[PDB]
C-alpha cells in the first residue's frame, strides 16, 4: 500500500547525475535529434514517423496505430543504407536512450517542484504525473549549448504543466483557463483589500481595485460563476441517516394530479 512510498522508492532506485554526465546525455540526445532530421530529409519520410518507429524498435515488442509488420518492414527498409547513413541510425538510437535516461534521472526534480502544489484540488500523484509530462516536454526542447543547468530550463516547463493541470482538472464543472486566472486574481485582490481595510471588502472596493472595466455587477457575476456544487450525499443532522438529496424533489416528471 501507500503508493507514494512505492513511487518514491522506484524513483530513488535511479541515481542522480553530475554536470559532466548531464551535459554528455544532453549532447547525445541533441546529436540523435540531428541524426533523425538528417535521415528524414535523406529518405523524404516524415520525421515524426521515423522517430516513432525508431523509438518503438528501441523499446521492443513490449510496447504494442502501427501494425508490427509495418514497423518491422520500415526497419528493414532503413537497413538499405550503404555507409555514412547507418551512423545516423546509431546516433539516433543512442539519443533515444539518452532521452530515456535523462528523464528517469530528473524525475526527482518533478517530485521536488510538485510537492509544493498540494491542496489545490489535485492529488499529489496527479501533480507528479503532470510534472512528468512537463519534464518530457522540457527534455524535448532543451538546448545544452547555453551551459545552463538542466533544472533551470526544466522548472519552467514543469510548473507550466502543473498550473495547466490545476486550471483544467480541479473543478467538476469546467471553467476556461482565462476565467480561472481571473478568479484567482480576484481572490488575491480581495484578500489584500481585507488586509488593508481590516474587514471583508465590499464589491465596490474589489471592482475599484481590479482596474478599468470592472464593476460590482461583474465581480458579483464572477463570484456566482465561481461557486462549486455540493454533494447530494452530504450528511444532514448529527446521526448518520439523512442525506442532502432527501430534501430535493423532482420537478420534471408530472405529478399524478397533473397527469389527470
Amino acid at each position: 500500500s501507500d503508493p507514494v512510498r512505492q513511487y518514491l522508492h522506484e524513483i530513488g532506485q535511479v541515481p542522480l547525475l553530475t554536470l559532466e554526465e548531464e551535459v554528455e546525455l544532453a549532447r547525445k540526445v541533441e546529436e540523435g535529434m540531428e541524426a533523425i532530421k538528417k535521415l528524414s530529409e535523406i529518405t523524404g519520410l516524415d520525421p515524426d514517423l521515423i522517430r516513432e518507429v525508431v523509438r518503438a524498435k528501441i523499446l521492443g515488442s513490449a510496447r504494442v496505430t502501427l501494425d508490427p509488420k509495418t514497423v518491422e518492414e520500415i526497419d528493414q527498409k532503413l537497413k538499405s543504407l550503404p555507409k555514412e547513413h547507418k551512423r545516423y541510425l546509431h546516433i539516433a538510437r543512442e539519443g533515444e536512450a539518452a532521452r530515456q535516461h535523462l528523464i528517469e534521472a530528473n524525475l526527482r526534480l518533478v517530485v521536488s517542484i510538485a510537492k509544493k502544489y498540494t491542496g489545490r484540488g489535485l492529488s499529489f500523484l496527479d501533480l507528479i504525473q503532470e510534472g512528468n509530462q512537463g519534464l518530457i516536454r522540457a527534455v524535448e526542447k532543451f538546448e545544452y549549448k547555453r551551459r545552463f543547468k538542466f533544472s533551470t530550463y526544466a522548472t519552467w516547463w514543469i510548473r507550466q504543466a502543473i498550473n495547466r493541470a490545476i486550471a483544467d482538472q480541479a473543478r467538476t464543472i469546467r471553467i476556461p483557463v482565462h476565467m480561472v486566472e481571473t478568479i484567482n486574481k480576484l481572490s488575491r485582490t480581495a484578500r489584500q483589500l481585507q488586509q488593508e481595510l481590516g474587514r471583508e471588502p465590499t464589491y465596490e472596493e474589489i471592482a475599484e481595485a481590479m482596474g478599468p472595466g470592472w464593476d460590482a455587477k461583474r465581480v458579483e457575476e464572477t463570484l456566482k460563476i465561481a461557486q462549486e456544487p455540493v454533494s447530494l450525499e452530504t450528511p444532514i443532522g448529527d446521526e448518520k441517516d439523512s442525506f442532502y438529496g432527501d430534501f430535493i424533489p423532482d420537478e420534471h416528471l408530472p405529478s399524478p394530479v397533473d397527469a389527470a
Binding site: G245, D246, P249, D250, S255, V257
Partner: protein, 48 residues
C-alpha cells in the same frame, strides 16, 4: 362529590395543589397527512 350525579365518591379522595407544566410537544406541530405530493429525484418515492 360527583358532578354528574351529586352523590359522593364512595371513598375519600386525595385532593391538593400540584405544579404542572405544559411541554413543547404539542399536537398542533405534529398532525400531518398527505394524499399525493413531491417525489424524490432518483428513487421516485415520496419525500419525508
Amino acid at each position: 362529590y360527583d358532578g354528574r350525579t351529586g352523590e359522593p365518591i364512595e371513598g375519600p379522595i386525595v385532593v391538593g395543589q400540584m405544579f404542572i407544566m405544559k411541554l413543547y410537544h404539542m399536537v398542533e406541530d405534529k398532525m400531518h397527512a398527505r394524499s399525493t405530493g413531491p417525489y424524490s429525484l432518483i428513487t421516485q418515492q415520496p419525500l419525508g
